[PDB]
Write a protein that binds this ligand. Structure first.
Ligand SMILES: Nc1ncnc2c1ncn2[C@@H]1O[C@H](COP(=O)(O)OP(=O)(O)OP(=O)(O)O)[C@@H](O)[C@H]1O
Ligand SMILES: Nc1ncnc2c1ncn2[C@@H]1O[C@H](COP(=O)(O)OP(=O)(O)OP(=O)(O)O)[C@@H](O)[C@H]1O
Lengths: 394, 394
């Protein structure tokens, strides 16, 4: 029984999973949080928070390697999947890692200096410690490359696109890809003749229009800061307003880059929490700023779901996924109520069911469009790309 | 036969019309272009481009006053309507100008320093030269004040809204108001039970969702720079991308404020023209960058039309208006083709007809939603507010 090791190297941490090739089931999971800071640590299955103590990316993956051996599965690791933040224009699908790929990832790395350089550090690490194991790079952008120029071009001068590569890329691609596939089976739809909208709702939120199995439009942009309002992210913001704030408050563009990214969104409006469970409780106890933040969140989601429906010849499904998408009875229903124009009717018995019910339809019978919850599994999708590329002669 | 003088004071010019109260018909029109620069001039009906020569706002309106007397209609001016750019939060409808109103306009003037200070200069001028004539202020934002918080709140921290007034305002309000009214008669719809989308397409472009006679959503934001891609305006732009451009190109926020406003949009992508007639010709002669700019323009309009449909309980009409909306057979049809998802069918015989056919339906019979062209008349709407307020005891 061979296994796939899945690595996601964030700026602050290293997430990992060990999935069994046979069944695509998680055997082990963990995180190396607070990376290379004065205090560094890893917690496998949240069962024993061990201490790294000021160790870097290389030593952190070396600690995960020790525990892979402590559980006698090191010699079972047939594949390693790397989650990559930004593939730029060069990467349209998942690849087997070579020296060339690294060069190409290094090339597009200015587009996301934070996450991408950490992704490479992980590639460098896993290579060093697992050299005779095939390694795969899976990109968070690659799915969205089917977008036509009219969908990815900004209104800016042409030079910014041709000389600097300023355009829409999109994110959550792996999630959007994974969910859309499952939707074809759940909704019983012919991929090649289908129109779906997928709402990835988590601390990061994005919408994707999938026409005939292809990503035709997506909510996020060049950076994850465009589109929906999120946990701490503002979403769509008037650039004139931002320029007006800069000249008024005296804050630099760097200052606002922190505000938009880390202080805005749900956290911004409520002034209470990035977390939705808190805000749902707050509103229940008569807190208006939380109610506002939620109603706004809902409104901006409804706008982009309906917006993205334009890039379809026909609408068949709206699919909810992500932390919020899967677990919030409230947000889902408020969003569907907001989309009555599209002829949606909801089944509140079905919409009441918790996530444990997995892939489920939540729309009543007379509805023009099928609504559904499909739990996202990025780890399974990464493993599947790896397994496929595992049979390839390189 | 009394008349209404209509004044629109831009940063660079002063537009004016003389409409007859009896029939609401234009008797005289003109412009005082290149204002207070080394060379200043006015052209009435484009019939004799006279020379002001370095004269300011006060002297320019004094020149228009001379020509009003030269045509023996000065003693007929019963009302004066002022087009005001930004009403802020204080102005929900059109008002009779008093000292209080001026104070209040001065208060919200930081929200639009360029246009608003020029608007006041015009108010100061018309007051001086026409003191015993009632004067009305009509706001380009007032219509959009029916927007709910979830529609006008940005994802930014709450303070920017409460202490600085950062929120969506919207523009083309007078146009959106005027067109929507006419739509009720043309489409034979009960205002109090209706859902319309209005696409104002000109050198400035904006979309408005009108639910039961009320503006519920609009494309533009705090400033006219948000929303659709326009002539020289970028439209919706990833703030992360703009921050990335700033740190990469070395340009300041002031530099980008010029680029977004005056160098981007249709002019930006094509690198040819702000004007659409040129780009339509260019594409015909096999120019891809013009074809791209148009296809993009179309895509971003379709997105926001469908987007804004979310704020409706039911969709009854899509209404095209503005320079482009009224005169471009191409753009209209490309937009409707892009909205097939909403069950629109077009009548290409009807869509072929030039603007001379005025208020017209352009959708075929089996269509789920009625499409129509309604020529906008801001001047008529301003006069109507003035005439109404003309019967009021103040
Ligand atoms: N039962 C629940 N009800 C409502 N909200 C929930 C529930 N469970 C989780 N959430 C919300 O889901 C969010 C976390 O989801 P998730 O783990 O997908 O975020 P993330 O992984 O950081 O973002 P991304 O998926 O974009 O990487 C939190 O904001 C939390 O409030
Ligand atoms: N026959 C036509 N075919 C195609 N496009 C046209 C035609 N006539 C005018 N236009 C376009 O209409 C635009 C000008 O419209 P308009 O006068 O409404 O702009 P504006 O008044 O500056 O903007 P706003 O109405 O927002 O104040 C130009 O971009 C022009 O290319």
């Amino acid at each position: 029984f061979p296994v796939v090791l899945v690595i996601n190297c964030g700026s602050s941490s290293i997430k990992f999973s060990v999935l069994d090739v046979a069944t695509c089931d998680v055997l082990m999971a963990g995180i190396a949080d607070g990376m290379n800071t004065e205090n560094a640590f890893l917690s496998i299955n949240g069962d024993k928070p061990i201490n790294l103590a000021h160790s870097n990316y290389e030593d952190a993956l070396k600690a995960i390697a020790f525990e892979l051996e402590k559980r006698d599965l090191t010699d079972s690791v047939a594949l390693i999947g790397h989650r990559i933040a930004h593939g730029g224009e060069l990467f349209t699908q998942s690849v087997i890692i070579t020296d060339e790929i690294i060069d190409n990832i290094r090339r597009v790395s200015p587009l996301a200096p934070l996450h991408n350089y950490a992704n490479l550090s992980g590639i460098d690490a896993a290579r060093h410690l697992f050299p005779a194991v095939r390694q795969v790079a899976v990109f968070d952008t690659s799915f969205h490359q089917t977008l036509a120029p009219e969908a990815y071009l900004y209104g800016l001068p042409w030079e910014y696109f041709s000389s600097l590569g300023v355009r829409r890329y999109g994110f959550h691609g792996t999630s959007h890809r994974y969910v859309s596939r499952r939707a074809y089976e759940l909704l019983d739809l012919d991929e090649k003749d289908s129109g779906l909208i997928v709402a990835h709702l988590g601390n990061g939120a994005s919408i994707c229009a999938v026409r005939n199995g292809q990503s035709v439009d997506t909510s996020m942009g060049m950076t994850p800061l465009e589109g929906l309002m999120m946990g701490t992210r503002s979403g769509d913001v008037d650039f004139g307003a931002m320029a007006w704030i800069a000249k008024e408050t005296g804050q630099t563009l760097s200052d606002l880059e922190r505000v938009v990214n880390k202080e805005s969104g749900l956290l911004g409006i409520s002034g209470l929490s990035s977390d939705l469970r808190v805000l749902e409780k707050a509103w229940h106890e008569g807190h208006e700023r939380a109610r506002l933040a939620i109603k706004t969140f809902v409104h901006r989601i409804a706008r982009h779901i309906a917006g993205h429906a334009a890039s379809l010849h026909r609408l068949d499904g709206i699919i909810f996924t992500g932390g919020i998408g899967e677990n919030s009875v409230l947000i889902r229903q408020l969003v569907i109520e907001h989309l009555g124009v599209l002829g949606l009717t909801l089944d509140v018995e079905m919409n009441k069911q918790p996530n444990s019910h997995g892939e489920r339809i939540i729309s009543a019978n007379p509805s023009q469009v099928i609504c559904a919850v499909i739990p996202t599994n990025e780890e399974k999708m990464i493993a599947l790309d790896a397994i496929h590329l595992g049979n390839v002669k390189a």
